[model samples]
Target: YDIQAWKKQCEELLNLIFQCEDSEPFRQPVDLLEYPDYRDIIDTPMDFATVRETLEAGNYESPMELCKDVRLIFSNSKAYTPSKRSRIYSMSLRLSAFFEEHISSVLSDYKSALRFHKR
Candidate 1:
């Protein structure tokens, strides 16, 4: 995707994502409903449906902001516990990957929206 188009779509997409952070309704386990705005975005039969399918397909963009919440949520748990630590690590990786891919796909899809001239 071209830079401008990427910016446009990404800004909207990222805005929808970040807006979830505002209401702070979600619990540690990441229940989808806690964030109504996110649900609205993801629940769509339109563009966001594409994003939802992509995420469900294991092509998620890493969830960078959510990881911080995870750290705080799990802080009370015993860090030295192997299973707890492993879960934290695994969730961290998946969330981060999801966010990264989300942004990357936004840019790619944005460019794909355009037609370029042959040299």
Candidate 2:
């Protein structure tokens, strides 16, 4: 996809993530067409629900493993500040914002999901 398409897609994913911030049990909808291409960024309700349960049961050694993976994805942007005209710059900026803006809320929701998993 081109730069604009990439930016728009990232923006859409970020918006859905924010919607989950204020609400629990928010299921990130699956666009069957987009799913295969963008599963890395999309977090479905079932995904969170299952993970919440897994964490709640204390089955996972590192609850923060996924957190680290996300951090790494955006960490690539620190390589440099590309010029505004650069597609790399726009894509990097949007990806950075998408993670920074909602990561905390995402963590909190997972905690709650874990706590309430079977209660």
Candidate 3:
């Protein structure tokens, strides 16, 4: 498999992530009207909907690039979410764990075919 097939598999994994229980809040860009302060705090917000668009558009050059964008959703969340005690904070953590839990498995199959050289 080439990069093309790797990306297609990534899309499939993304679809599964969308169906995850803790995935709702990260599904789309946060509602600016409801949380106007969000823009002020997060310089670059990531969400599943946005990530999906980026994937479809072929913007991600490698698996790690895509992982960072996906992980950024949680990174942004952990920063903005007030406390570890909050449900949203935990939800973010859970989804992030889900990502880590399965990311390698998706790449494993394609690993033999492609090796993304990094600088």
Candidate 4:
């Protein structure tokens, strides 16, 4: 894919991620999509939900690991600084859990599937 296409795709994915893990899950749909901004691609619920579900359902660990980076970016951003250490810790812990689960689960599934059929 070209640079523009790749960026568009990446932005779409980032938005999905930001939306899925939003603490305020009940916030307006648009608000949820408008955070952890990377450049200008705002994260949307549709984007986040789709990415999370798709990654969790498949054999992809990259996205899971990427999620940790997302949290780090948010925690480091100055636009919206979360000053509470507990909040940061909680977010990190939860993200770690999700990341670990997806990575391990996907790897095991992929290995099991491979045993059944060669790649």
* Top-lDDT candidate index: 3
Model 1 clashing-pair count: 15
State residue 84's C-alpha deviation in candidate 3, in Å.
Answer: 0.7
Best by TM-score: 3
Give each model's whole-structure lDDT: 0.40, 0.43, 0.83, 0.41
Model 2's alpha-carbon lDDT is 0.43
Clashing pairs in 3: none
TM-score versus the correct structure, for each prediction = 0.30, 0.34, 0.86, 0.33
Task: Quote the positional error of residue 25 for candidate 1 in Å.
Answer: 15
Go through the candidates in order and give the clash count of each.
15, 0, 0, 4
Q: Per-residue alpha-carbon lDDT of model 4 for 1-119, expressed as tens digits? A: 12122223434544544655533332123243455453344332322344445445553344334454444433433223345445534564555455445445443544565556653
What is the overall TM-score of model 3 with all chains considered together?
0.86
Q: Can you tell me which runs of candidate 4 are displaced by over 4 Å?
A: 1-47, 52-89
TM-score ranking from best candidate downward: 3, 2, 4, 1
**What CA root-mean-square deviation does each model show from the true structure?**
13.1, 14.3, 2.9, 10.6
lDDT of 3 by residue, 1-119 (tens): 45456787788888889999899988999888988899889999889999899988978877778888988999898888888888887998888888888788656645645655221
Candidates arranged by lDDT, highest first: 3, 2, 4, 1
